[PDB]
Design a binder for this molecule. Structure first.
Ligand code: SF4
Length: 71
């Protein structure tokens, strides 16, 4: 399965991730991206139909702020 998070420390608020994949990411309020549904650790499990989309924005994020991994 796939899980993803956003590092707010490095996000440049380019709006790419939560414009492309609103199912996974959202504008936290001030332009910084955040997963729509994080756990205590901050990770969000990605629905299988959204895996390829999540992997794409992970590579496309200009600031390397999106962290994604297989679990
Ligand atoms: S794509 Fe990266 S830099 Fe752009 S809003 Fe999302 S996390 Fe921030």
């Amino acid at each position: 399965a796939l899980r993803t998070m956003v590092d707010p420390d490095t996000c440049t608020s380019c709006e790419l991730c939560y414009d492309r994949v609103p199912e996974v990411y959202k504008n936290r309020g001030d332009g910084i991206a955040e997963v729509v549904s994080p756990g205590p650790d901050g990770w969000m499990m990605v629905p299988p139909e959204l895996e390829q989309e999540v992997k794409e924005v992970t590579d496309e994020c200009p600031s390397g702020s999106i962290i994604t991994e297989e679990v």
